[PDB]
C-alpha cells in the first residue's frame, strides 16, 4: 500500500484524521497527539521507510527535505526562539513506530540530555 | 565568524573523528551524554538549521546516512537517537549545524 500499514501510512492516506500543516509530494507534517512540548509536530516521508538504519543512500535528499519541512513549518508556526528536531531508532531510541519520522519540539526551552 | 567546529574540521585542534569524507565529517562529543555520543557536521558552515537553505536538502540528509552508518559500525546495534539543536530553546550550543547522535544507553521520553 502506498505509505505502508503503520499509523502513520493510514495519515497520508487520510484514512485517519490528522492535524496537517503541510503536505507535498515527498512528506506530509503533522501535530503529535500526546505532545512533549507547547508545540509538538511530525514530518514524515511518504514512501516508506521503516527506520533510520535501513534508509538507502539514494534516501538522502529526502531525509533532508524532511528537515528543511521541518525549520519551514516551526518558522510558520511562529518558534522563533528555537525548536529540537529528533529522529529515534529503535528500542534504545525509543521508537514505537516503524515508519522514519522526524519530531520537532518547540515552544518552552529544551533541557539537555535529550533524554 | 569561526566556531569551535571550524578548527576540529581544520584539524587546528584535537578530536576524535570517526569518519570523514568531501562535504562532512563524523567525531566524538567532547560532553557526552550517553556511553556511544558523537556529532556529524557539514564542512560548509551553515550557523543554524533555521537559514540552511532548499540546495542544502542533499547535505542534510548525507549527514543522516553517515550518522546511520557511522552507529552501525560503533555496534549501535539497539538503536540510537539523532539530535538537530536550534536556538536558545533548542538548547543549540555550537553556531555550527551539528547533528548529534546517542546511544549505549536506553534514550528517554520526553527528549528534553
Ligand atoms: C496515544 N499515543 C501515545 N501516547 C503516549 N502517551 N505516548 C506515546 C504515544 N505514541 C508514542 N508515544 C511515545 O512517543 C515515544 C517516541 O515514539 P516515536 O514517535 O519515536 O515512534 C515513544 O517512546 C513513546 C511510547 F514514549
Ligand atoms: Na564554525
Redesign the interface.
Given at each position: 500500500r502506498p505509505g505502508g500499514d503503520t499509523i502513520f501510512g493510514k495519515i497520508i492516506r487520510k484514512e485517519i484524521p490528522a492535524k496537517i500543516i503541510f503536505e507535498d509530494d515527498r512528506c506530509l507534517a503533522f501535530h503529535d497527539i500526546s505532545p512533549?512540548?507547547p508545540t509538538h509536530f511530525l514530518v514524515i516521508p511518504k514512501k516508506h521507510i521503516s527506520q533510520?538504519?535501513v534508509?538507502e543512500?539514494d534516501?538522502?535528499?529526502?531525509?533532508?527535505?524532511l528537515?528543511?519541512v521541518g525549520?519551514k513549518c516551526?518558522?510558520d508556526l511562529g518558534?522563533n526562539?528555537?525548536?529540537?528536531?529528533?529522529?529515534?531508532?529503535?528500542?534504545?531510541?525509543?521508537?514505537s513506530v516503524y515508519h522514519v519520522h522526524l519530531?520537532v519540539?518547540?515552544?518552552?526551552?529544551?533541557?539537555?540530555?535529550?533524554?
Open positions: 512533549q512540548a533510520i538504519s534508509a543512500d534516501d538522502e535528499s529526502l531525509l533532508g527535505h528537515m528543511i525549520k516551526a518558522a518558534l526562539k528555537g525548536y529540537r528536531m529528533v529522529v529515534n531508532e529503535g528500542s534504545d531510541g525509543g521508537q519530531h519540539l518547540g515552544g518552552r526551552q529544551m533541557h539537555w540530555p535529550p533524554g
